[PDB]
Amino acid sequence: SDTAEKAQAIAAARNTFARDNPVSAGHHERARRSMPGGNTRSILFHRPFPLVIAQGTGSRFQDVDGHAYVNFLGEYTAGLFGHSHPVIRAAVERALAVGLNLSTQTENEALFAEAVCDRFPSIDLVRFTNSGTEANLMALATATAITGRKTVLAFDGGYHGGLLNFASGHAPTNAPYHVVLGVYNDVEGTADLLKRHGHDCAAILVEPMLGAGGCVPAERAFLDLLRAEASRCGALLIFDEVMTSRLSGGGAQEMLGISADLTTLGKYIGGGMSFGAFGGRRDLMERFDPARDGAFAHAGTFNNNILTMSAGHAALTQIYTRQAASDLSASGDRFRANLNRIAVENQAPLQFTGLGSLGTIHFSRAPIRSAGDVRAADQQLKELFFFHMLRKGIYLAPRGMYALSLEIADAGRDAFAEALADFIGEQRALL
Amino acid sequence: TAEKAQAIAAARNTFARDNPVSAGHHERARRSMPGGNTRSILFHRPFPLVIAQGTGSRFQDVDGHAYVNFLGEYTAGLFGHSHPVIRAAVERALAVGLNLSTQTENEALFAEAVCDRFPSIDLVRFTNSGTEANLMALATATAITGRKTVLAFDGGYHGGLLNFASGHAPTNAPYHVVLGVYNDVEGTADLLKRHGHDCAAILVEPMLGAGGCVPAERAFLDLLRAEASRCGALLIFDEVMTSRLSGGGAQEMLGISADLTTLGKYIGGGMSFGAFGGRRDLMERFDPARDGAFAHAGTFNNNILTMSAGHAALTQIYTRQAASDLSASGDRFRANLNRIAVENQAPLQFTGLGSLGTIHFSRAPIRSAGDVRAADQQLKELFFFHMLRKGIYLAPRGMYALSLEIADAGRDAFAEALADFIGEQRALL
Numbered sequence: 001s002d003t004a005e006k007a008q009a010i011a012a013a014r015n016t017f018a019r020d021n022p023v024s025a026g027h028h029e030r031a032r033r034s035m036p037g038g039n040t041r042s043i044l045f046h047r048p049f050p051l052v053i054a055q056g057t058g059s060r061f062q063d064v065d066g067h068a069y070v071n072f073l074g075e076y077t078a079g080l081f082g083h084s085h086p087v088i089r090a091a092v093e094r095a096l097a098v099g100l101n102l103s104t105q106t107e108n109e110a111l112f113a114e115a116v117c118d119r120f121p122s123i124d125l126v127r128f129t130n131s132g133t134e135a136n137l138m139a140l141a142t143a144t145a146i147t148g149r150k151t152v153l154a155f156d157g158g159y160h161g162g163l164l165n166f167a168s169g170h171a172p173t174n175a176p177y178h179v180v181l182g183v184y185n186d187v188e189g190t191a192d193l194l195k196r197h198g199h200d201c202a203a204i205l206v207e208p209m210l211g212a213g214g215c216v217p218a219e220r221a222f223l224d225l226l227r228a229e230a231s232r233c234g235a236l237l238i239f240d241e242v243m244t245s246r247l248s249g250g251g252a253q254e255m256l257g258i259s260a261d262l263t264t265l266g267k268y269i270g271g272g273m274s275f276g277a278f279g280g281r282r283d284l285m286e287r288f289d290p291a292r293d294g295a296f297a298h299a300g301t302f303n304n305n306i307l308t309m310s311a312g313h314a315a316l317t318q319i320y321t322r323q324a325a326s327d328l329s330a331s332g333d334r335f336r337a338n339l340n341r342i343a344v345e346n347q348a349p350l351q352f353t354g355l356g357s358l359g360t361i362h363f364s365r366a367p368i369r370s371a372g373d374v375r376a377a378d379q380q381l382k383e384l385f386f387f388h389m390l391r392k393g394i395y396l397a398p399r400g401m402y403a404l405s406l407e408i409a410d411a412g413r414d415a416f417a418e419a420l421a422d423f424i425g426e427q428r429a430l431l
Numbered sequence: 432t433a434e435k436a437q438a439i440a441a442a443r444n445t446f447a448r449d450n451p452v453s454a455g456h457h458e459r460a461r462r463s464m465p466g467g468n469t470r471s472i473l474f475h476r477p478f479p480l481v482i483a484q485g486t487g488s489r490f491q492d493v494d495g496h497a498y499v500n501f502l503g504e505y506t507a508g509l510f511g512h513s514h515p516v517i518r519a520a521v522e523r524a525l526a527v528g529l530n531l532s533t534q535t536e537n538e539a540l541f542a543e544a545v546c547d548r549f550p551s552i553d554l555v556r557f558t559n560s561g562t563e564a565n566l567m568a569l570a571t572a573t574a575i576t577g578r579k580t581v582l583a584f585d586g587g588y589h590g591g592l593l594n595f596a597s598g599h600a601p602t603n604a605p606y607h608v609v610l611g612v613y614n615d616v617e618g619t620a621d622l623l624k625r626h627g628h629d630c631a632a633i634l635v636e637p638m639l640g641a642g643g644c645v646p647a648e649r650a651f652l653d654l655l656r657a658e659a660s661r662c663g664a665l666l667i668f669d670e671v672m673t674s675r676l677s678g679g680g681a682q683e684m685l686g687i688s689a690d691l692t693t694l695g696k697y698i699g700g701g702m703s704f705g706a707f708g709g710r711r712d713l714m715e716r717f718d719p720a721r722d723g724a725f726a727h728a729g730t731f732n733n734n735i736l737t738m739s740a741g742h743a744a745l746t747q748i749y750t751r752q753a754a755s756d757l758s759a760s761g762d763r764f765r766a767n768l769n770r771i772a773v774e775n776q777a778p779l780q781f782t783g784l785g786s787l788g789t790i791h792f793s794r795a796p797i798r799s800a801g802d803v804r805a806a807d808q809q810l811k812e813l814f815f816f817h818m819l820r821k822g823i824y825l826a827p828r829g830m831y832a833l834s835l836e837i838a839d840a841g842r843d844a845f846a847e848a849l850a851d852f853i854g855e856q857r858a859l860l
C-alpha cells in the first residue's frame with residue numbers, strides 16, 4: 001500500500017528529473033497543442049513529462065537535454081536491432097531501389113511469408129498486417145466467422161492491442177467483441193468458465209507470457225487446459241505471440257510443444273518497420289484464399305509495403321536466425337538470473353519475472369502468476385526504480401520492463417546490474 | 432451475356448499467355464499465403480501481376496512488361512515510386528534512429544502540420560492504418576456517448592474490419608452497425624428517427640472511394656450534420672481518400688465540419704499511416720494525464736519513418752497549392768475522359784472528384800452503391816485487361832488515383848487507350 005515516505009521519495013525523483021530536463025519539459029507543453037496531452041502512444045507518457053530523444057545509434061540514445069542512455073526498453077520488444085542496424089539499413093536501401101507504393105504484389109512479400117512459415121511450426125499459411133492489434137483483430141474475425149460464435153475467452157492482465165486491452169480488465173474503448181475474462185494461470189477458475197461459455201466460444205485468446213501484464217509466464221497446466229478445451233468445445237485457440245515469438249526460433253510453441261490453431265505476430269519480426277501477422281493451420285487460413293467461393297476478405301493498404309517485406313525478411317533470415325534466438329534467450333536467462341541473485345543476496349523484496357531476453361521488475365516476494373499478483377506488488381517502488389535507472393543512464397520502461405536488443409553487450413548488462421545493486425543500497429530504508 | 436463472358440475468357444487467356452512468370456510466382460506464393468495473397472484487393476483472375484521494380488510513375492512486371500501506374504496505391508501512392516523528397520525524409524529518419532522507444536520532436540512537427548492543414552482537426556493522434564483510425568474513431572464515439580449504434584452506408588469502406596462495400600460481412604468488427612443508402616435523404620432520415628436515441632456515431636466518406644468514387648450530395652451531408660447534432664451522435668468524416676481533394680480535404684471545400692475526422696494513405700508519405708482527430712474537447716479524452724483517460728496504444732504509431740516522410744509529404748511536396756493544382760488537373764482529366772465517351776456515344780462514364788475517378792458502364796446517375804452494382808460488371812473487367820495490354824495500370828475495379836508523377840504522356844496514353852477500347856469493343860457496347 002501507498003506510504004507518505006515513498007510518495008515523498010517519488011516527488012523528489014520527479015522534481016530532479018524535471019529540473020534536469022527543461023528542454024523536454026518545454027517540448028511537452030508545445031506538443032499538447034497538436035496531440036492530446038502531447039501524446040500519440042499512451043505508453044510513452046509518464047509524469048511529470050516524458051523524455052524527448054534527439055538521436056540514437058546502436059543501443060544508445062541522447063535526449064534533447066544532452067543526457068546519454070543505454071536503451072534496455074528496446075521498443076517494447078520491437079526494437080531488437082537497436083537504432084541503426086546496418087543489415088536493416090541495407091534492407092531499407094534495397095526496398096527503395098525496388099520502389100515504394102508499387103500498388104501491386106512483389107516477390108518480396110512471398111519471400112517474407114516463406115521465412116515466417118519456415119520457422120514457426122504451427123503457421124502453415126500467414127497474412128501480414130500493419131500492427132499486432134490488426135493481427136489479433138483479424139484472428140478474432142477469423143474465429144467468429146468460421147465458428148459462427150460470438151464469445152471470446154481472454155484473460156485479465158492480457159494485452160492484445162489498442163482495441164483489445166485487458167491489462168486493467170474491461171476498457172470502454174475495446175472493440176465490442178463479447179469477451180469473458182478469466183484469471184491468468186487459474187486452472188480451476190478457467191475450467192469453470194469454459195463449462196459455462198465453451199459451447200459458444202469462438203476463440204480463446206492468450207499470450208504464452210503476459211507481456212504488458214508483467215512478463216508473467218504461463219504455467220504448462222494452464223496452457224494444457226486451454227488447448228484441451230478449445231479442441232473439445234470447438235473454439236479456436238489463438239496464441240498471441242507478438243512478444244513471445246522471439247523466445248526461440250519457433251517462439252513459445254516450439255518451446256512448449258503446444259500448437260495453437262492461430263498465431264499472431266508483431267513488433268520485431270518486421271525488422272523495426274510497421275508490422276503484424278496472423279497465421280496458423282492451413283484449413284483455417286485457406287478461408288482467405290480470394291479464389292474460393294465465400295472467401296473471407298483481408299484488406300490493408302500497407303500490409304505488403306516494400307519496407308516491411310524487405311526489412312522483415314532480413315530480420316528473420318540475416319539477423320535473428322533461429323540460432324540467434326536461442327542464443328539471445330540463453331543470454332537473457334543468465335541476465336535475469338543474475339538480477340535475481342543480486343536481489344536474494346541483498347534480501348531485497350523484489351524479483352525479475354519473464355522468459356529469455358524479456359523481464360519485468362516486481363516489488364514482491366510472492367510468486368507472480370496472475371494480474372492480481374502484479375497489481376499487489378509495490379507500485380511506488382516500481383516508479384522510484386524507473387527514475388533511479390534514468391539517473392544511472394539506463395533507460396527501461398516506466399513499468400520496469402526490459403527487452404534486450406541484439407546490441408546490448410557486457411558493458412550494458414554490467415551497468416544494469418550495478419545500478420540495481422545501487423538502488424537496493426540507496427533505498428534500503430524503503431525496502 | 433454469353434458474348435461478354437467469352438470475351439472475358441479470351442482476355443483472361445491472353446493475360447495468362449502474356450504473363451507466365453507472374454503465373455509461376457503465384458503458384459509458389461500460394462504455399463505460404465492464402466491464395467498467394469496478403470491484400471485481398473490485389474488478387475484478380477486468372478492471377479495477379481507480380482511487379483519487379485518501379486521508378487516515378489512507371490513500373491515493370493516480372494515478365495518485363497512496362498506500365499504507367501494510374502492506380503497510385505489506391506490514393507496512398509501520391510508521390511510515385513521513387514520521390515527524392517520522400518527518399519531524403521527516409522534518410523533523415525535513419526539518421527535520427529530507428530525504434531528509439533521514446534518520443535522525438537518529429538511526431539509533434541507532423542501533428543502540427545496535420546492540425547494546421549485540416550480545419551476541423553484541433554488535435555490528432557497517429558495510427559498505423561486507416562482501419563485503425565476508423566476503429567479508434569468508433570471507439571471514441573461509443574465510449575464518450577455510452578451508446579452502441581453506428582450508422583454507416585451500404586457501399587461504404589472504412590477499412591478491412593469496417594467493410595460495407597457489399598453490405599455486412601461476417602469478418603467485420605462487431606459494432607452494432609445499421610446501414611443506410613448513400614445519398615438517400617428520406618431513407619436515412621427515417622433510420623435516424625428509429626435509431627437516433629442509441630446512435631453513437633454516423634460514419635461516412637464525403638465520397639465513396641472503394642464504393643466507386645461516388646460523391647456525396649450536399650443535401651445528404653447536411654442531413655447527417657443536423658441529425659448527428661440533434662441526437663448527440665458524433666459525425667465522423669472518413670477522409671482517408673478525400674483529404675487530398677484540397678489542402679483541407681472535403682471539409683474545407685464543403686464548409687461542413689465533422690466532429691471527428693479520419694485520415695490515412697498518402698499523408699504518411701507512402702509509409703504506414705493513419706490518423707484520427709477532430710474537436711478539441713472530444714480528442715482531449717485521450718490525454719493520458721486526465722482522469723478516466725482513454726488509452727490509445729500502438730507500437731509504430733509514432734515511428735520515425737512515418738513522422739519524417741509524413742511531415743515532408745504535407746509541408747514540402749503535397750502543399751495546399753499542390754493539392755489545388757492536382758485536383759484541377761484531375762478534373763480536366765476526368766472531363767476529357769467523359770468527353771471522349773460522349774463523342775463516341777459510349778455507354779460509360781467516369782465518376783469522382785479532383786484526381787480520383789472510377790469508370791462505370793452505365794449512363795444512369797451514379798449516386799449510391801445500388802447504381803454502381805447495376806452498371807455492367809463484365810465490361811468493367813474487359814476494360815481492366817484492355818488497359819493492361821496498352822501499358823496502363825489501374826485498379827481491376829476501374830479506379831485511377833493520379834499521382835504527382837503522372838504527366839502529359841501518361842494522361843494522353845490513357846485517353847487514347849479509352850478511345851481504342853470504345854472502338855475495339857463497339858460490338859459489346
Ligand SMILES: *Cc1c(COP(=O)(O)O)cnc(C)c1O
Nearest residue numbers: 131132133159160161242729730
Ligand atoms: C505490442 C503487442 C500487441 C500490439 O501490437 P501493436 O503493433 O502495438 O498494435 C499485441 N499483443 C501483444 C502481446 C503485444 O505485446
Ligand SMILES: *Cc1c(COP(=O)(O)O)cnc(C)c1O
Nearest residue numbers: 300301560561562588589590671
Ligand atoms: C483505404 C481506406 C481505409 C483503410 O485504410 P487502411 O490503411 O487500408 O487500413 C479506410 N477508409 C477509406 C475511405 C479508405 O479508402
Ligand SMILES: O=C(O)CCC(=O)C(=O)O
Nearest residue numbers: 299300301470472505641
Ligand atoms: O489495399 C487494401 O487492401 C485496401 C485498399 C482500399 O482501401 C481500396 O479498396 O481502395
Ligand SMILES: O=C(O)CCC(=O)C(=O)O
Nearest residue numbers: 041043076212728729730
Ligand atoms: O507501444 C505501444 O503503444 C504498445 C506497446 C505494448 O504493447 C506494451 O505496452 O508493451
